[PDB]
């Protein structure tokens, strides 16, 4: 299992590099600085914490060390605070694109930079409060024993309720906001295609510019991909917890399965900048410029 270490560190570094580049890009290219991209930066920094914090946290939890239950709940459940901060941003962004494309005229004055700060703040407030509830007294602990005397060993299915983990953080905090984003995009993709087909059946441009719609929509499709990947990285872990939780009777998920899902989830913080490079000219060009200068 020394390999589960090498891949985690390989992912640790990867995630910090790529995501700092996203933030370096936006700081740098003037065109990149906009509301839609603050939610992307909130998204990148929430992926930098993972490389800096939650992996060292997650590789350390693999030992099963000893520590005070209430300080211990902090080191297992910090990832919850991030994964959840991710989600409010993706959903923020989606709404943004939805408003921008579906209600183009009211947008400029509706969405503003300082209204964007409000969200990002509140979403960080509610990500800690939601992520750390097990600290709020939802602890499963006090009621391998060598540990004793104030120290109780730190494991996930012991101290952290599979109760709150299946119902509250999956059903309520993820499945719901995800099914919400699937809707909001599909609403854009399906609304946009009618607007595009209704410019066809009619002569002359206007009110909207056709070429400039399908250009907005290609970037929306590109922001939705990210959403889909999240589901693909964070779903199995829950699919697996379902099979483990709904049966605190039936058998438990094996070894080479679980760590594979923890990795697979932590993978979520790497691919993002990579999608931007492939799918978005403006980041790809800033990445390129940055890399061929500051790294040259």
């Amino acid at each position, epitope marked *: 299992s020394s390999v589960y270490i090498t891949v985690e560190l390989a992912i640790a570094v990867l995630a910090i590099l790529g995501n700092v580049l996203v933030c370096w890009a936006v700081w740098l*290219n*003037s*065109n*990149l*600085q*906009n509301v*839609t*991209n603050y939610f992307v930066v909130s998204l990148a920094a929430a992926d930098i914490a993972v490389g800096v914090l939650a992996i060292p946290f997650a590789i350390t939890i693999s030992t099963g060390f000893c520590a005070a239950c209430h300080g211990c709940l902090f080191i297992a459940c910090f990832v919850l605070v991030l994964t959840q901060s991710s989600i409010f941003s993706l959903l923020a962004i989606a709404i943004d*694109r939805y408003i*921008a494309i579906r209600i*183009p*005229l*009211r*947008y*400029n*004055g509706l969405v503003t930079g300082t209204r964007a700060k409000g969200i990002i703040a509140i979403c960080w407030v509610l990500s800690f409060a939601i992520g750390l509830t097990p600290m709020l007294g939802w602890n499963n602990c006090g009621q391998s024993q060598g540990c004793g005397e104030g120290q109780v060993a730190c494991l996930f299915e012991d101290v952290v309720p599979m109760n709150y983990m299946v119902y509250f953080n999956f059903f309520a905090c993820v499945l719901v906001p995800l099914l919400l984003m699937l809707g909001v995009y599909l609403r854009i993709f399906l609304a946009a295609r009618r607007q595009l087909k209704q410019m066809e059946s009619q002569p*002359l*441009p*206007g*009110e909207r*510019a*056709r*070429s*400039t719609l399908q*250009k*907005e929509v290609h*970037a929306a499709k*590109s922001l939705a991909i990210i959403v889909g990947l999240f589901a693909l990285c964070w779903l199995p872990l829950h699919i697996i917890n379902c099979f483990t939780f709904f049966c605190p009777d039936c058998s438990h998920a094996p070894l080479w399965l679980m760590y594979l899902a923890i990795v697979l989830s932590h993978t979520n913080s790497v691919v993002n900048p990579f999608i*931007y490079a492939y799918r*978005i*000219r*403006e*980041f790809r*060009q*800033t990445f390129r*410029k940055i890399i061929r200068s500051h790294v040259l």
Partner: antibody
Amino acid sequence: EVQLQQSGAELVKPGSSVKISCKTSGDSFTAYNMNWVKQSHGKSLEWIGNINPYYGSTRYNQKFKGKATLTVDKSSSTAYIQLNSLTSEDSAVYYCAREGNYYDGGSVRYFDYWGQGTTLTVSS
Amino acid sequence: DIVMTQSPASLSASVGDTVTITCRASEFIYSSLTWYQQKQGGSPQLLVYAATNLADAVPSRFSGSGSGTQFSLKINRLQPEDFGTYYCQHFYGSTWAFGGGTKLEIKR
């Protein structure tokens, strides 16, 4: 249909002021930044500045700060440009252009629609 | 600030031959370069935006290309309607600036 309809030619004595108007019909006026450009001797183009029609907020090209001041009227849905302390060097054609915006991941901007131009001649 | 400069300042061409005009920004603007076509006594019209993208109902024969500091508009197989002077504009940054234009004239 979208038209930007500019006020007509102006003939002025140096040292005076002028308000050139741009009326926009055929869309929502408050959704887009209005910009003004100046064309001198039917060749070179300069960006004068622009204005957010919703809040009346303006950015100016530095060269034009203090000679040009931009203002709007939402009701009649028209944008203005006023020129002060006019001299011959200000004789040109001033256009209004409507800026346009979308997210490519970057903020894409262009001048969608332009007015017909209005001719300002300063002489003594 | 960011100085835009294009070439050539005048170009004369026969109908049907292909033409490229170039535009060079004094700083790195990525895309954020646009192109305008102005016919004599007319107001400029939008040609290419994002430096690669054609405007609604602009003939496919026009194409933009380039990025960073170097851009070019190329008209394939020129048409009589294409003669006129062409301008580029950068939207990079807060303050914006045009080209000198290039004047496309008929060879005879």
